[model samples]
Target: DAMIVIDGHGIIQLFSTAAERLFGWSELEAIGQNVNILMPEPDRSRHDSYISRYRTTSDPHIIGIGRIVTGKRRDGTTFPMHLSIGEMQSGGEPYFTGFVRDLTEHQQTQARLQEL
Candidate 1:
């Protein structure tokens, strides 16, 4: 129930209604904020570099793909999440749309099953 839209420069262009509920921040506060706000420590700091590398090298890492990762909440809490990225080109520039799903309980269930 969350959606994130990023502009060509990788800045947050839109945060959906459900995203506000999940992240505890209103769309007004999240729009224009860096998408990295949802990222954890090293990933947060390395976000720009990662994007730059992908653009320059044409070697994709997180772009055009979806994967499971961790996110950091405003309260310094972390949770497992699934992220899918979609690309859109506007005015000759490529932008991104990310769909996020919280997986804290899903991962916990998997772990529990493994132990059983």
Candidate 2:
């Protein structure tokens, strides 16, 4: 499964080797960086806040739900992604693992159908 490991602050502790292939990101550059660095605006700006909110409150946004949203690549292009989240702890600290599936091909085909 496509995966990314993030800390409580939304900093990416790990971006799987598989993720680099799918998103065209430099694995070395992505690690130890905030997860939002790979996200487009709106979500990119608000995701950390959402995580903070969820950590404090019982609100649900992208947690425990598989949803389609936009993702950013190292090339600076944004594309659609099907994403889900799972929470875990390490060193007695909160962490999260994200699972994502690239939706670029599916979206392109849909667009072609609409154009035809």
Candidate 3:
């Protein structure tokens, strides 16, 4: 499982080693970068709006609830992933820690079984 932490601004505060391998981004380059960089397509483009919406409405779309989503690699390749976010407060500021599991192999296995 990969672990990533993002601040209120959605800036990556910590990127775990597993995250580095899963997303193909080293911690040195990932820290201080927007968490959307790890997302694909529309998510990459609209993540900020989603965050702002959450902040505004205090309604959670994915926080504490896991969902299957797509992840983008450094090479621009895409893969399926299961993402779960947990919200926390540090110094009265919001922070989100995401737990990610790459679903590529899992889906592949299912597909292969279905082919039988």
Candidate 4:
């Protein structure tokens, strides 16, 4: 599991220890980067649209909900993951905290079971 926090503008503010290990990115390098850097394409390119839509419409998609998603590591390899986001406010500024669970091993186990 990994925890990452980003500002309203999608800048990575906190990259936790588990995030560093899971994403293959050092905290020093991950912080201040766009949270999109952790995502695969389509999502990576469209995340800003999500932010804008949420802000403008107060519509929720993945917010407050968990879903199976994809994550891209530093080596540009992609893997399955579960992602949930929490929205909070501090000093009237909004931030999002993402909880990530790597699903690659779980998916592999399922695949193996199907071979039986």
Best-matching candidate per TM-score: 4
**CA lDDT of each prediction against the hidden true structure:** 0.83, 0.87, 0.92, 0.93
Residue 19 C-alpha lDDT in model 1: 88
Off-target runs (Cα >4 Å) in candidate 1 are 114-116
lDDT of 4 by residue, 1-83 (tens): 99999998899999999999999999999999999999988999999888988988998999877899889999999999999
Compose the digit string of candidate 3's lDDT tens values, residues 1-116: 99999998899999999999988889999999999999787888899999999999999989877799989999999999999999999998889999998899998999999999
Q: Clashes in model 2: which pairs?
A: none
Residue pairs with clashing backbones, model 4 = none
lDDT of 1 by residue, 1-116 (tens): 58998876679888899888778778888888888898887899888787778778878766666789998777778889888887788888878888989998998999999999
After superposing candidate 3 on the true structure, give the runs of residues whose Cα lies further than 4 Å from its correct spot.
Answer: none
**Candidate 2 lDDT over residue span 1-116, tens digit each:** 46999999999888898998877876788888889887888888888888889999967777887799888887888889999998899999999999999889999999999999
- Compute the lDDT of residue 6 as modeled in candidate 4: 93
**Deviation in Å, model 2, residue 39 alpha carbon:** 0.8
* Superposed Cα deviation of residue 64, candidate 1 (Å): 3.5
Model 4 misplaced stretches (Cα beyond 4 Å): none
Q: Which residue ranges in model 2 land beyond 4 Å of their true spot?
A: none
TM-score of each: 0.88, 0.92, 0.95, 0.96
